[PDB]
Paper text:
In humans, the uniporter functions as a holocomplex (referred to as uniplex henceforth) and consists of the pore-forming subunit MCU, an essential membrane-spanning subunit EMRE, and the gate-keeping subunits MICU1 and MICU2. The two-transmembrane (2-TM) MCU component forms a tetrameric channel pore and the single-TM EMRE becomes an integral part of the channel by forming a 1:1 stoichiometric subcomplex with MCU and renders the channel conductive. MICU1 and MICU2 are two paralogous EF-hand containing proteins that are localized to the mitochondrial intermembrane space (IMS) and function as gate-keepers by sensing the cytosolic Ca2+ concentration and, thereby, regulate MCU-EMRE channel activity.
The major class of particles (class 1) represents a blocked uniplex in which a heterodimer of MICU1 and MICU2 blocks the central ion conduction pore of a monomeric MCU-EMRE subcomplex. Similar MICU1-MICU2 blocking is also observed in the second class (class 2) with the exception being that MCU-EMRE subcomplex retains its dimeric form. Firstly, the α1 helix of MICU1 is oriented directly above the ion conduction pore with its N-terminus pointing toward the C-terminus of the EMRE helix. Secondly, the α2 helix is positioned directly above the D-ring of MCU’s selectivity filter, which is formed by the four Asp261s from the DIME motif at the external entrance of the channel tetramer. Most notably, Lys126 is well positioned to point its side chain directly toward the center of the D-ring and block the channel filter. Thirdly, the amphipathic C-terminal helix (C-helix, α17) of MICU1 lies on the membrane surface between two neighboring EMRE subunits with its N-terminus sandwiched between the C-termini of an EMRE helix and the TM1 from a neighboring MCU subunit.
Numbering used by the authors:
A (entry chain F), B (entry chain H): 48 to 96
C (entry chain D): 48 to 98
D (entry chain B): 48 to 97
E (entry chain G): 191 to 340
F (entry chain E): 191 to 343
G (entry chain C), H (entry chain A): 191 to 341
I (entry chain R): 87 to 206, 229 to 399
J (entry chain Q): 104 to 470
Write the structure that this text describes.
Amino acid sequence: VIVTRSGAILPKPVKMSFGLLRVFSIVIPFLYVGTLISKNFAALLEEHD
Amino acid sequence: VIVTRSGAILPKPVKMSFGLLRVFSIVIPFLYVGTLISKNFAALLEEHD
Amino acid sequence: VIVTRSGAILPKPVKMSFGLLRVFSIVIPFLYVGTLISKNFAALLEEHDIF
Amino acid sequence: VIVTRSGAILPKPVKMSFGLLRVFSIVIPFLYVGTLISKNFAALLEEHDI
Amino acid sequence: CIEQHQLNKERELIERLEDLKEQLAPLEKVRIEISRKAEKRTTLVLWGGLAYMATQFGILARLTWWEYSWDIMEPVTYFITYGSAMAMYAYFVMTRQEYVYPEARDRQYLLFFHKGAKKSRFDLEKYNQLKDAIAQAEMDLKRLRDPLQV
Amino acid sequence: CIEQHQLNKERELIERLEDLKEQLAPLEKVRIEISRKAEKRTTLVLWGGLAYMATQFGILARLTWWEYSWDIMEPVTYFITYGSAMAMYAYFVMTRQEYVYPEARDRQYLLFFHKGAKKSRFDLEKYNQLKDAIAQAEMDLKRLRDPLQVHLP
Amino acid sequence: CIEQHQLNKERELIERLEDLKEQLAPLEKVRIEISRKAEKRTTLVLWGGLAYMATQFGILARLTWWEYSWDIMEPVTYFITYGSAMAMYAYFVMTRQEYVYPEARDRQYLLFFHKGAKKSRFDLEKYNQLKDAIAQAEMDLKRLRDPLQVH
Amino acid sequence: CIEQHQLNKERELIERLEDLKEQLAPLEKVRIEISRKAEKRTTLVLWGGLAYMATQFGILARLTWWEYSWDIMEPVTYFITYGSAMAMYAYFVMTRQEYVYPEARDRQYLLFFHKGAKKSRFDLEKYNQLKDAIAQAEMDLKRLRDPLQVH
Amino acid sequence: KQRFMQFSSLEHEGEYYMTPRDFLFSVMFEQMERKTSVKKLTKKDIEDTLSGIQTAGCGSTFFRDLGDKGLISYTEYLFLLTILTKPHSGFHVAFKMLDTDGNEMIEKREFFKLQKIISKEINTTLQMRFFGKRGQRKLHYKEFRRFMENLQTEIQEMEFLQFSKGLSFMRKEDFAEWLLFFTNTENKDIYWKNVREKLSAGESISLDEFKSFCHFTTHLEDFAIAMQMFSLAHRPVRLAEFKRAVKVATGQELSNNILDTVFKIFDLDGDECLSHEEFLGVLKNRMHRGL
Amino acid sequence: SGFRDRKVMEYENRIRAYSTPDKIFRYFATLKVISEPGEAEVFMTPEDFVRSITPNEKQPEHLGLDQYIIKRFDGKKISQEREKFADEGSIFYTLGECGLISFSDYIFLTTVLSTPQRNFEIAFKMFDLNGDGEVDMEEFEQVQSIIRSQTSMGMRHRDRPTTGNTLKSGLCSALTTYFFGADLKGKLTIKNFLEFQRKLQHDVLKLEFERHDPVDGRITERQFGGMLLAYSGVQSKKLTAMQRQLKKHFKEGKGLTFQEVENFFTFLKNINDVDTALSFYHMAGASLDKVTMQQVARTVAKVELSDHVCDVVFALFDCDGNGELSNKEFVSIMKQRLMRGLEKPKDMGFTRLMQAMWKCAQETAWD
C-alpha cells in the first residue's frame, strides 16, 4: 500500500482542512439539540398521559 | 470510483420503482403478525401453566 | 459477479457433503459439553477451596 | 488463495518475534494502571466531594 | 502475407460470429427463462430475509412491553445475537466463503439457477462453450481492427 | 516517402486530439459546475449523517440519567441497534450493493450528479463519448511514440 | 529455409515443456500429500472454532437461565463480547493484517503447509521456481501459436 | 535498420539503467532511514491503541466489580460502544476511508512519513521520479529480452 | 486570639487580662485607633473583682455596671466568644458531663478544665460569681442559661444603642447598615443598591423586634431546611411563607419593615421573592464575624 | 462461606446500595396475589421488607427476581380468614392488607424511616394551613413529593407496576385505613405521626431482632455484634477481636434480651449529640470506661444499660484490644448503622462534581 508498483512513494493524503474544529463544532450543537428536543418530548408526553 | 480511466462519469444507478413503498409494505404486516403470535404464544403458555 | 467477462455463466457452486448435518451434529454435543462443564466445575469450586 | 496465478505456492507467513509472550505482557500493566486510577477516581470523588 | 490472410480472416470471422449467433438463439431462449425463475426465487429469498428481520423484531417487541419483562428477555435477546454470529461462522465453514450480502445472493442465485438447469436439461456445457468461442472471436475482431488503426 | 507519411499520420492523430480537446472545453465547464453543486449537496449529506448520529446520542444521554432510568431506555437501545442492521439489510434489498461508507458516498454523489444532469439538461452522452475518445487517442498515441517502436526520429 | 527451422524451434519448445512437466513429477507427490495433511489440520481448526463457540454458548446457557440469574452474568457477558473485539484488534497487530475469516484461514493453512515443509525438507523453493518456469513456457507457447499471426 | 537499433539501444539502455542506479545510490539510504523513523513511531501508536483498549477494559472492570453496580455502569458501557461507532463515522468524514486497520496504519504511516521527509528535507519528488524512470527502464529490458530471443 | 493581645488591659505574672469594657470594645468594634493599654495588676484588682461584683446588676446590665472592674483571661475571652458566636455548642451537655452524680450543679474545679476544651491562683469575676466568693456554691443550669440569655441580650442592647446613633430606635437603614457590618461581597454593591434606591429609609424600629431578629438568627439551620424545602418545591417565597418560616424557626413572629426590607435587599432577579440561600449566607457572614 | 453464596451476597449488596428502587421491590418481593377478575399484584412480606433493607442477607433461590410464591386469594374461592403474615398490632398489619406491603408502601416506609424527625417537624409546620403542623391529605401528598425527592432521587414510572399515580392511591389506603379514618376529613398531628414513625421503627427492629432465632430470647454475642455492625465493610477482624477479648471474660454464654438492645437503639437516637460529651471527655483526661459509659447514657438519654451490653460494645470498638475505646470511629459507625446506608443510592456523583467544577469555573470567572 505504502509503495507503488514502481516502489515509488505515494503522496500525502489530504486532511479535511480544519476538520477537527468542524467535527466537534457539529458534535456539540446536535448534542445540545438532542438534549433539548427530548426534554421537550418528555415535558409534553408527561402531560399527555 | 466516480469516473473511469477515461474520466468518463459513470452511469446513473438503478432504483426499483416505488421501492421504498415496496419495502415499507413488507416491514409492517410481518411485524404485526409476529406481534399477533406473541399473544398466541403467551396465552397458550399461560394456558398450559 | 454471476457472469464471466466472457459473457458466460460461472461454474457450479459447491457445498460440503453432509456438512449441514455436520453442523447440526457438532453444535449439539458441544452445547451439551458447555452445559456439563460448568456443573462439574462450580460444585467443584465450592467443594475444594474458597481462598 | 495460497496458490498464485502461475501455480506456484505463496511464501511462509511471518510471525513476529514471540508475540504471544509479549502482547500478553503488555495488556496486564496497562490494566493495572487503569484499575488503579479508577480506584483513585472514586476516592477523589469522595475527597473533592468532601 | 497479411492482406490475403486478413481478407480471409475478417470474412471468416464474421462467418464464425454469424454461425455462433445462429447456434446461440435456441440455448439463450432457454437461458432467459431459467435465469428469470432463478431471479424470482432469489428475490423471494431477499424479501423473506426482511420478513425474518421484521417478524423477529415484532415478536420481541410485544413481549417486553406488554406481557413479559425486558429483565427476563434480555438474555434470550443476547443469545439470538450470539447464535447469529455462530450462524455466520457456520455459513463460512459450510460455504468456504465469507457471509456477506451480495456474495450470499450470488451463491443462492447460482444454486437456484442450477436447479433449474437440472430441471430443464439445459446445455450449460454448450452455452458457456459458445460464449467462450464468441468471446474469442470478439477478441479476434478487436485485434483485427486495432492494427487497422495503425 | 516513409517519414513524411509517418509524421502525417502523427500530425493527423494529434490534431484530431486537438479538435476533440477543443470540443472538450465548453462542456467541461458545465460539468465542473454541476460537479461542485452536487458535491456541496453530498457534503451536506455526509455531515447530516453525523448530525443524526449526534442528536440520537443527545436524546439517549438525557433520557437515562435525568428523567428516565436505564431500565426504561435499555430495550429502546436494543431495538435501535437491531433496526440498524435491519435498515442496513433493507438498503441491500433496495439497491444491489452493501451499506459501505465510501461506496454509498460515491452512490449518493453520482445520484445527485444525475439529478443535476436532468435539471440542467446538458449533453452527458456526448460528454461520455467525447471523453472516451480523448483517452483512446491518448493511449494509442502512447503506443505510437515508443522509443522502442520508433516512428519519429 | 525458415519452415523446418521455426517448426524445430517450436518442437524444442514443446520438448522444453516436456522436460518441465517431467521434472515436476517426482516432486509433486510430496506436495500433494503435505497439502492433504495440512488440509485436515485446517479442517480440525475450523470445526474446532465452531466447537469453541458452541461451548462458550453452552456455558452461559447452563448458568444464566436456571442455574443462576441473568443480572449477575450480564457483566461477564459484556466483558466476553468486548474481549472478543480486543483479541481481534490484537490479531490485527500481532499479524499486521486484518482478521477476516477466509483470509485468516488461508494464513493458517499456509502456516501449516510451511510447518509440514520444514519437517519434509523437499526444496519447495526449487519446486515453485520450476512452477514459474513451466507457466512461463506455457505463455510462450500460447504467444508463439497465435492463430491470427502466421508462423 | 531495425536490429542494430535494438543492440546499440540495449547497451545504452542498460548503461542508462546503471546511471539511474548510481544516481539513486546516495539517496535511498536516507529513504530507509526515514522509513525507520516513521515506522517505529507508527508501531508505537498501534501498541498504544492496544494499550488504550486494555485500560478501557480495566477501568470498567474495577469501576463495576469493586465500586458500583453493573446497572449503574451498563449505560456508560453502552455509550462507549456507541461513541466508537460514532467516532469511526467521524473518521470517514475526515478522510474518505472505511477505517479498516491496514488502511488505518497505512494512512498513519503516510502521515508520519511525509512529516519525516519534510523535516529531513528529503527530495521525495526526485526520489519517486527517479524510481519511476528506473521501473520504466526495467520493464523495457524485460520486454527487450523476449522478442529479441523468442521473436 | 491575637485580638486578646490587641485588646489586653491588665498584667499579672505576665498574664494579659481584659476588662469587661475592653471586651465590649472587642465585640462592638473590630479594631480601633484606641491603644488598649496594659498596666500591672496590683492586689486591689482581686478586690476590684469583689467590689464590682458586690455592686453590679447580675443580668443584662452586668458589664455596663462593671466597666473596667473585672478580669477576663484569654481562655475566658475565647469562652465569651463561644457564647456570643456559638449557641448550643454544648451547654446542657457540659452540666450533664462535667459534674454529674445528681443534678446539673457544676463544681468550681471542673470550671477551668471547662474553659480550654469547649474553646477548641487568683480568680476572675466568673468563678467569683458562679460558685460564690471562693467556690462555696454550685452553678445552676437554668441560672446559667438565664446568664447566656441576658448576656447575649446585653450584647444586642449595646449594638442597638451604639448603632442607634443616639436615637431611641433603629431606623430601617440603621438596622440594615448594622446588618452589613460583616458583608464583603461583589454583589455588596448590589446589596447596598437597594439600600440607596429601593429603601423607604428611616422608619424607626424598636429594640424588642431587634431581639426577635437576633433570636431568629440563632435558630437558623431550621430556616435553612425550610428554604431547602422551598428549593425542592417551585412555590416562590412570598411574604406569608417567609413569615411562617420565621415562626417555625422560632415560635415567635415579628415586624413588617424588617421583613419587607429583607425582601427588598433579596429580590435579586426574582421579583417579590426571597434570595433565600443568599440571605442565609449574608447572615452567616454576619455570624462568623471573620474566619 | 460458599463462593456462590459470597457472590450472591456481593450482588445483593450491590442491589441494596445502587439499584433502582422499583427493581429492588421486584427483587425482594415473593408474593403475587391474584385479584381474580383483574390480575395479580406483587406484595412482599415484612421479612422480605427486612431483607430489602438489610445488607449481607439473602432470600432463597426460587424467589430471586420476579419469581413469586403465587397466592390466589380472592375470587370464587371462599376466603374467610386470609393469612395473617404480620402480627396484629404491627404497623404492617395496620396497612391495607392482613400483613402485606405494597410497592407504594415500600417507598413510603423508606421515606418515613430513613429521614430524621426534625425534617418532618419542619415539613408539617410549613404546609399545614396554620403553621402548626395540622395537615390534610393534599399537603401530605406535598410532603411525600418533597421527601421522595430526598433519598430515592432516581425514581421512575414504568406504569406497569405501582410506580404511577396508584402510588398516591396506596398512600390513600394508608390514610383511609389509619390516618384520616373513613371520611378523610380530619387532620393528623405532628405527634401522632412521630409516634407512628417510632412504632414503625420499633416493629422493624423487633423483626430484625427476630430473624436470628434468639434462643430463650437471647442472641449470641457474636451475632449481636454482627447485628450492631450491619452497615459496614468487613469488620470481621474486629468481630473476632471482640470475640477473643470476650473469650477472656466469662460472659459469652449469657445472651442478650430484646429489651436491652431496644434501650440501646433508643439511646442511639440521642447519641449523635454526645459526640460532644465523649469528645470533651477525651481532652479532660478521663478514660473511656464502661461504667462512665452507662452513667453518661443514663444521664443524657436516661435509658438503663446492663454491663454485659457495654462489655460487648466496648470490646467491639476498643482500640484493637488495648482496653480503650475510640471516639469518632465509633461515632461514624453508629451514624452508619443509624442511617442504614441511606445517602446517595444509585450514584451519579460525577454530576455533582461537574457542578462543582463549574462553580470553580464561576469562581475563576470572578477573576
